Design a protein around this ligand. Sequence first.
Ligand SMILES: O=C1C=C2C[C@]3(O)COc4c(ccc(O)c4O)C3=C2C=C1O
Ligand SMILES: [Cl-]
Length: 313
Amino acid sequence: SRARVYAEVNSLRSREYWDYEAHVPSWGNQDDYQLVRKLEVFEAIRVVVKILKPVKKKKIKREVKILENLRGGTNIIKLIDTVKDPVSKTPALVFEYINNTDFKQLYQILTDFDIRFYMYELLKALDYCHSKGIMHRDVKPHNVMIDHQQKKLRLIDWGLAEFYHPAQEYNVRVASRYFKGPELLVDYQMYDYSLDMWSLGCMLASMIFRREPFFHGQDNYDQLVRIAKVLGTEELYGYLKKYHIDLDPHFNDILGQHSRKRWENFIHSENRHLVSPEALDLLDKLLRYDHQQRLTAKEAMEHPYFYPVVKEQ
Ligand SMILES: O=C1C=C2C[C@]3(O)COc4c(ccc(O)c4O)C3=C2C=C1O
Ligand SMILES: [Cl-]
């Protein structure tokens, strides 16, 4: 399997780009930054300070190299410095301050324009990083930072983000349960930037249908079952057949007969305004079992759904 876009990007670049094992950060004095408040992560002297956890050294390079690569990115959060504590020789990331407004409080008040705006802003981010050979693997509304007064956005926490090298197999052990795409739930390693487009999409469902999460699996197997109830099982099975995927025996007695529903099955009085058939066209093109069948980040910014947002640019 391969990416429809940006697939060579890293290959055409100096090894130094994407070989993070070879990265050597300069760690600075965290005494430049004092605890003000806690979010883990803290606010400080403004900034936000991330204390890297009991994590292997290799995992840390990957997140610094990637943040430097994406420095100067549209709607991508930015790194002011990487530091350590004098007494505590533990590594630390320090980011620009965005004045957050927790998505659970801010989603319920969104207008059918707010949604496309903030989704457009997300796609600006995802496409930019997809164009640098990096894939996020952790797009949830938690990692989507918004300032509704400022109407700014930042995609955050690149703790999990990996460089894309074609035909490379990746850990299927990433992302949050609700925003995991089918590739992760059926143990398929040869995934790419499409994953984030499932993530994003999943969030689209939530924003216009106000069912948050949209796919609320109660375990990791159920998370695929929950998806088969919308998208249908036959279309699922064909997807597995195509990529010659071994289906774990536990899925045997928990899928069965399921039908492609109508994305309109999810409209009701409370969400009526927020749905437009342009939302329901993009959305379909975004939530497809087959990672390759899915919209790219670019093709998405082109969907009609955003014609109202491009107009006021
Ligand atoms: O891994 C993380 C995790 C967070 C959690 C979180 O604290 C959310 O809230 C934030 C923020 C950063 C700046 C900011 O201004 C803000 O409000 C966050 C992060 C950045 C990261 O890289
Ligand atoms: Cl990983």
